[PDB]
Every structure is written in C-alpha cells, then in structure tokens.
Design an enzyme around this catalytic site. Structure first.
Site, PDB file in Angstrom:
ATOM      1  N   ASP A 104     -20.504  33.013   5.619  1.00  0.00           N
ATOM      2  CA  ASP A 104     -19.403  34.009   5.076  1.00  0.00           C
ATOM      3  C   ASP A 104     -20.205  35.096   4.608  1.00  0.00           C
ATOM      4  OD1 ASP A 104     -17.406  31.957   4.825  1.00  0.00           O
ATOM      5  OD2 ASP A 104     -18.163  31.205   2.815  1.00  0.00           O
TER       6      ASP A 104
ATOM      7  N   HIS B  75     -15.868  28.500  -1.007  1.00  0.00           N
ATOM      8  CA  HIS B  75     -15.856  28.754   0.334  1.00  0.00           C
ATOM      9  C   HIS B  75     -14.453  28.647   0.879  1.00  0.00           C
ATOM     10  CE1 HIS B  75     -16.733  28.596   4.605  1.00  0.00           C
ATOM     11  NE2 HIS B  75     -16.525  27.218   4.727  1.00  0.00           N
TER      12      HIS B  75
HETATM   13  N1  LIG Z   1     -18.950  25.266   5.438  1.00  0.00           N
HETATM   14  C1  LIG Z   1     -19.068  26.140   6.446  1.00  0.00           C
HETATM   15  O1  LIG Z   1     -19.448  26.971   6.424  1.00  0.00           O
HETATM   16  C2  LIG Z   1     -18.494  25.286   7.667  1.00  0.00           C
HETATM   17  C3  LIG Z   1     -18.395  26.071   8.943  1.00  0.00           C
HETATM   18  C4  LIG Z   1     -17.731  25.002   9.988  1.00  0.00           C
HETATM   19  C5  LIG Z   1     -17.630  23.923   9.780  1.00  0.00           C
HETATM   20  N2  LIG Z   1     -18.018  23.040   8.631  1.00  0.00           N
HETATM   21  C6  LIG Z   1     -17.495  21.854   8.239  1.00  0.00           C
HETATM   22  O2  LIG Z   1     -18.807  20.950   8.843  1.00  0.00           O
HETATM   23  C7  LIG Z   1     -18.214  19.677   9.323  1.00  0.00           C
HETATM   24  C8  LIG Z   1     -18.605  19.480  10.860  1.00  0.00           C
HETATM   25  O3  LIG Z   1     -17.557  19.772  11.702  1.00  0.00           O
HETATM   26  P1  LIG Z   1     -17.827  20.015  13.080  1.00  0.00           P
HETATM   27  O4  LIG Z   1     -17.257  21.531  13.791  1.00  0.00           O
HETATM   28  O5  LIG Z   1     -19.158  20.267  13.475  1.00  0.00           O
HETATM   29  O6  LIG Z   1     -18.176  18.832  14.141  1.00  0.00           O
HETATM   30  P2  LIG Z   1     -17.131  17.693  14.665  1.00  0.00           P
HETATM   31  O7  LIG Z   1     -15.796  17.258  13.780  1.00  0.00           O
HETATM   32  O8  LIG Z   1     -16.938  17.813  16.068  1.00  0.00           O
HETATM   33  O9  LIG Z   1     -18.392  16.298  14.377  1.00  0.00           O
HETATM   34  C9  LIG Z   1     -18.958  16.003  13.187  1.00  0.00           C
HETATM   35  C10 LIG Z   1     -19.196  14.759  13.195  1.00  0.00           C
HETATM   36  O10 LIG Z   1     -19.462  14.020  11.742  1.00  0.00           O
HETATM   37  C11 LIG Z   1     -19.409  12.757  12.211  1.00  0.00           C
HETATM   38  N3  LIG Z   1     -19.303  11.967  10.762  1.00  0.00           N
HETATM   39  C12 LIG Z   1     -17.989  11.703  10.270  1.00  0.00           C
HETATM   40  N4  LIG Z   1     -18.042  10.764   9.390  1.00  0.00           N
HETATM   41  C13 LIG Z   1     -19.624  10.684   9.208  1.00  0.00           C
HETATM   42  C14 LIG Z   1     -20.180   9.505   8.429  1.00  0.00           C
HETATM   43  N5  LIG Z   1     -19.942   9.039   7.506  1.00  0.00           N
HETATM   44  N6  LIG Z   1     -21.596   9.862   8.584  1.00  0.00           N
HETATM   45  C15 LIG Z   1     -22.179  10.367   9.463  1.00  0.00           C
HETATM   46  N7  LIG Z   1     -21.452  11.176  10.430  1.00  0.00           N
HETATM   47  C16 LIG Z   1     -20.177  11.343  10.300  1.00  0.00           C
HETATM   48  C17 LIG Z   1     -18.318  12.642  13.443  1.00  0.00           C
HETATM   49  O11 LIG Z   1     -18.588  11.172  13.784  1.00  0.00           O
HETATM   50  C18 LIG Z   1     -18.656  13.601  14.089  1.00  0.00           C
HETATM   51  O12 LIG Z   1     -19.378  13.286  15.183  1.00  0.00           O
HETATM   52  C19 LIG Z   1     -16.782  19.783   8.848  1.00  0.00           C
HETATM   53  O13 LIG Z   1     -16.547  19.313   7.621  1.00  0.00           O
HETATM   54  C20 LIG Z   1     -16.434  21.379   9.232  1.00  0.00           C
HETATM   55  O14 LIG Z   1     -15.092  21.520   8.673  1.00  0.00           O
HETATM   56  C21 LIG Z   1     -18.170  23.983   7.833  1.00  0.00           C
END
Ligand SMILES: NC(=O)c1ccc[n+]([C@@H]2O[C@H](COP(=O)([O-])OP(=O)(O)OC[C@H]3O[C@@H](n4cnc5c(N)ncnc54)[C@H](O)[C@@H]3O)[C@@H](O)[C@H]2O)c1
Ligand SMILES: NC(=O)c1ccc[n+]([C@@H]2O[C@H](COP(=O)([O-])OP(=O)(O)OC[C@H]3O[C@@H](n4cnc5c(N)ncnc54)[C@H](O)[C@@H]3O)[C@@H](O)[C@H]2O)c1
Lengths: 333, 333
Positions: free
Chosen positions: B158, B186
C-alpha cells in the site's frame, strides 16, 4: 545513466512474470541503468497485461522511468536496444499430441521484420520461446538490416542446470563450477560438455572428469538428467520452470551487458558462420563464447574428442532438418 | 555469520513463488547471512514444493544452507527467527460483493499457538494472508509468550502503491518520494496520507501538496485509487497481487532487519496499544514507523488535520468492526 528501451514479448506468460521484476531491480543492466519497459502480448491478453503493468508500478522501482503495454508491434519494436522474445505458443508433443509446433515460426518472421523496421539497428535480440534455436535463426533472416551477431538464443538455462548437477554430485557449489559447455540445439539433442570444466576442490581447481571419477555417468544419465530437467520440474510444480528460467535469462543478458568473467566462458546459441568446429554455417547453434563489449567470440581451438564430435554432429543434423522444415513454413525461398 | 530459520507458509502458492528467489539471494537478510529455509503448505501440495526445491538448486543460491518442505508444524514452526505467514485463501472477484473471507481466521489462531509452542520467543512474525490486520491480531492473541511487539502485518504494498501514484503524477522516481504514511486497515478504508511527505524536485525537496498543486486530486482521486488498487489488479489478472506483494514483504522485512534509513519512516501494521494519535487500543493498525535494532517506534507529534482525523477514525472502526466478526467466529460453531 540514461533510459534504455527493453521489450519483453510473451509478457503475460509465466516466465515474464518472474523476469520483469528482476529486470526492474537493476539486476541485469545496472543499479545505475534506468529502463523503459515495453510489454507485448496478444490482444486477448491485454487485460492481464495491464494488471501486470499495475504491479510493476506498485513495486515502486526507481530504475523504471516508464512502462508500456502493447498489442501493436510499432510501439513494441520502436527504438529498442534490447529485445527479449519469450512470446510463443506452448511447446509440447508431436504425435503423442501436438504434431508439429513449427508454426511458432510464422511469429519470429513477423518479429524480425518488425525488428527490421522499427528497432535500433544495434538492438540485441535474445530468443527464449521454443523452439528457441530455429525461431531465432528464422528471426535473423527477417532482420537483414540487423547484424547476424546480435541475435542469440537461450541455452544458459541448460548451462545452469548442468552446473547444478555437477555441484550436487561432488558436494560443492554451483559457483564452484567453471566452463561447462552446452552445444547445439536447446533440445533433446543438447550436448552438456564437461570435458573442459573445472571445480574448486580444496584450494585446487581440479577438473570435472578428474573430480567425478565416474566417466560413464558424465556420458549418460548426467546428460539425461539435464535434458529431463524441464519436464521434471513441470512434473512436480505442474507449472512452467519460471523462477529458474527467468534467472538464466537474467544471466544471458547480464553477461552480454557486462562481459564474461576472466578465464571463463558461457554458452549461447549464436550463428555458426565461420565456426572452427566443423559445424555447418548458417545454423543457430550453441557454442562456448566469451564477451567483451556486448560482443561474443567463439572460444577456439578446444580439443574435441570422439564422444563430443559425434554428439555435436547429431545436434547439427537436427538443427539442419528444422531449418529445412521452417523454410517452407516461412514466406520466402 | 550464522544461519537463521525463516518460515514461509503457503510456500506452494503464488506470492511464495515470487518471493523465494529474493530470500535466497541475500537481498533480504544480507549477503553474508545464511538461511535455513523452511517451507510450509498443505499435504496435497508437497509434490509442488519438491518442484520448487528443484528450481531453487538450479538458481544457485548458496545462502540456503537447507530447504525444508513440510506439512507438520511441529516441524515448520520449530526454532524460528522469522516467520512469514502468507498461507491462506486469496480474495477472488465477488471481492466486490462481500469480503468476509472468515475462511482464514482459524489458520492464524492455530498458527499462533504453534508459534507459541515451537518458535523462538524472539521470533518476528510477518503476516501477509488477508485480511492482514485482523489475521495478525488473531495470531498474536494465541501467542502470549511471544511479545505482541513482535507481530506486524503487511501494509507496505500500500505504502509503495501511494509512492507510485505520486511519482507518475509528478514524473519523478519512486526513490524521489518520501515519508508517506498508510493509516488504518489494509482496506479500501486505508488512508494514504501525504501531509508529511516530501518530494525531491530538481530545485528542492518540497511538500507533496506543494509540488502537486492539486489538493482535490490528493484529497479525492489520489485517495480512491490507492484504496481500490488491490481490487483493480484482480479484475485485470484474475489473480491478486503477487509480484508487487512479494516485493513489499522484502521491503517490510528489510527495514526490520537493517532499520529504516534516517529521516525516513515506513508504514507497518503493529499493535495499537498506546498511540499518541487517538486510535483505540488493542488493534492491529498501520502507523508510521521508525526501526532501530529490529524494534519499531511510532512517529509522534505529526499534526493531524480534521480531514485526516476523519479518515483515521473511519478505518479504526472497520478494524474494530472486523475484530468483532473474527472473535465471534472463533468462539462459535
Ligand atoms: N496483505 C497484502 O498485502 C496481500 C497482497 C496480496 C495477497 N495477500 C494475501 O496473501 C495470501 C496469499 O495469496 P496468494 O496469491 O499468494 O497465493 P495462492 O492462493 O495461490 O496460494 C497460497 C497458498 O496458501 C496455502 N495454504 C492454505 N492453507 C494453508 C495452511 N493451513 N497452511 C499452510 N499453507 C496453507 C495454499 O495451499 C496455497 O498453496 C492470500 O490471503 C492473499 O489474499 C495479501
Ligand atoms: N529456451 C529455454 O531455456 C526455455 C525454457 C523454458 C521455456 N522456454 C520457452 O519460453 C516461452 C515462454 O514460456 P512460458 O512458460 O513463459 O509461457 P506462457 O504460456 O505462460 O506465456 C506465453 C505468453 O506468450 C503469449 N503470446 C503468444 N503469442 C504471442 C505473440 N505473438 N507475441 C507476444 N506474446 C505472445 C501468450 O499469450 C502468453 O501470454 C515458451 O516458448 C517456452 O516454452 C524456453
């Protein structure tokens, strides 16, 4: 210290997504080199492309003076210094499925021609989309206005792989391994050559064969390992070998931009014309090369044995056949 | 010079895939700092990781003394120095319908107890899985033995988003924008604050408000864009932030490890407890930070206009709102 125009085609694909960042960081052309990023892909990919464009800004990179997305070659090829051609329709089969993905060559004629027209005549073109060797050759016949010499394909990936394999074996680091050679086609016929490699052992640089003490291995499964690698990785990940290929691309360009280290040489597919190895001219073959000011020079006078010569003959014949094969595809004889 | 164990959850996903090459590089923890990279995912994702372990070898990363892939968390959380919690459900369209991705809250609660049980009580927890703030609160709450000060969530994507909006606008470089503040959640309710920012123009460093010369822009459409960015990328790519989010974890983690540069303060979501700025206590809220010895300090005495209070209050209410929802879910069935 002054804007350089870099184009990455296939820019909505997987390798590009890992590659762009790294170009952006100044990991390739200088922490001192500002870039103008040009992004090209296919129309139906222009939504994803903007998304990917938003994301390059959101990285807030100082080197990146500007960023562009496009569907149109004038913009894409206009005034470039560097072109990285990743774009192409996914490589596979033959009969086990997709019969003969040779029509990916109709694309580089189109790109060489655009390079021909708009690009700066000093543009360095690096071909990643497969089949790399033959699209690059093809791209060079369409770019008669641009020098033969500043067209190259990617083999570094295979070259890095080879090194990682060696390290594994001897229990050293891939940084301990010099002068690996990838010869020929980026393919099932590549010849990972370690007859000329070295390895830090102790406070000694011994020599790959000396070191391994197991010749049959370096001449079989070692060779297989390196060829299988792309598939193996896709086998597990189920996706493109993106982090590692992007790294290899970075190296490929970074080495053209700054030169090779002293006493060492890298693999790059280039134009054979005038080769000292017995490889047919007017082929896009991979060789041991050295680089000074963005200029490569084939390493010459390296002793070439029986095993090696054969292997190098086999990869030539295949490249040769792909050339005959792309040429009725392509719009001129 | 001695390794640290760094945990990356959701190690087989999209952000993890963009982030791992940069932990391995030395560019996060230093060039002379080895890591023992622990990777965590769900049982069915272990073959993927194997795959990623494969690419990590091919990427020549000597800093990696070891690469542990696991689905056990008596394994993954054990002896940590740094924990990076990405693993969770990502937002998908109908991200613009309802966002009560509550799907997620149980994973933080459970991961906090694990951290409590197994990680070094000095562990520095970095929470990325969205909703950033509220997941971070749930985790700290379950980890009494770990100093609440040790937890922070990610708002640096952000922060850099806003810097990025300033740059395009003024036509400077990201590096040229300083002292931006992201306040609150956020969320689309975050507040990209520029009353204390400074821009570097050829003639002098000036206030953003002053360089820009368009208050309405900064009070209106500048605001709107930075708060809808995340959702705008998902609409584009059909996926959420990866490249940019990865890049930002690096930043976040780096400021912690080596401190923020002087005269510069960054945004970081830390525990509310004790603000000089009117924000309720016991909240996981983004504030302006200074870091010295891995310990952050809130920037104080920054005058808050009415417009700004307004915005800050709006966001601490959604935070509260959100807290209510979470802790009801957790003690429900
Ligand atoms: N706050 C930020 O700045 C920001 C920005 C983008 C994404 N995010 C968040 O980060 C997270 C990651 O999303 P993404 O696009 O990387 O990946 P994605 O959804 O493609 O994969 C993330 C992984 O997390 C794994 N996962 C689920 N439950 C789990 C558990 N109990 N233990 C361990 N691993 C587990 C899944 O198997 C998956 O492989 C999401 O919550 C997304 O919304 C946050
Ligand atoms: N040489 C090597 O070492 C090596 C290694 C791995 C892959 N590759 C090749 O690199 C290329 C990229 O692989 P990927 O995983 O990135 O693929 P991908 O399918 O994820 O992405 C390819 C992109 O190319 C686009 N595209 C198609 N035609 C285009 C055109 N005319 N102009 C621009 N873009 C166009 C597609 O729309 C897509 O966005 C492929 O050819 C791949 O097989 C080479």
């Amino acid at each position: 210290s002054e804007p350089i125009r870099v184009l990455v085609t296939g820019a909505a694909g997987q390798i590009a997504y890992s590659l762009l960042y790294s170009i952006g960081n100044g990991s390739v052309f200088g922490k001192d080199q500002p870039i103008i990023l040009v992004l090209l892909d296919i129309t139906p990919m222009m939504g994803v492309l903007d998304g990917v464009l938003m994301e390059l800004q959101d990285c807030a990179l100082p080197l990146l003076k500007d960023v562009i997305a496009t569907d149109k070659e004038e913009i894409a090829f206009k005034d470039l210094d560097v072109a990285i051609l990743v774009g192409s329709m996914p490589r596979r089969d033959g009969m086990e499925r997709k019969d003969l993905l040779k029509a990916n060559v109709k694309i580089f004629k189109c790109q060489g021609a655009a390079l021909d027209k708009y690009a700066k005549k000093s543009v360095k073109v690096i071909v990643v989309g497969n089949p790399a060797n033959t699209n690059c050759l093809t791209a060079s016949k369409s770019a008669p206005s641009i020098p033969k010499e500043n067209f190259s394909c990617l083999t570094r990936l295979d070259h890095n792989r080879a090194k990682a394999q060696i390290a594994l074996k001897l229990g050293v680091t891939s940084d301990d391994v010099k002068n690996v050679i990838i010869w020929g086609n980026h393919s099932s016929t590549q010849y990972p050559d370690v007859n000329h490699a070295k390895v830090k052992l102790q406070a000694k640089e011994v020599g790959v064969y000396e070191a391994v003490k197991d010749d049959s291995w370096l001449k079989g499964e070692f060779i297989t390992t390196v060829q299988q690698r792309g598939a193996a990785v896709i086998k597990a990940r189920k996706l493109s070998s993106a982090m590692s290929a992007a790294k290899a691309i970075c190296d490929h360009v970074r080495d053209i931009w700054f030169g090779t280290p002293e006493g060492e040489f890298v693999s790059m597919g280039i134009i054979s014309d005038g080769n000292s190895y017995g490889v047919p001219d007017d082929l896009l073959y991979s060789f041991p090369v050295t680089i000074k000011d963005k200029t490569w020079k084939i390493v010459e006078g390296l002793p070439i044995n029986d095993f090696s010569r054969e292997k190098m003959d086999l990869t030539a014949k295949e490249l040769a056949e792909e050339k005959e094969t792309a040429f009725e595809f392509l719009s001129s004889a």
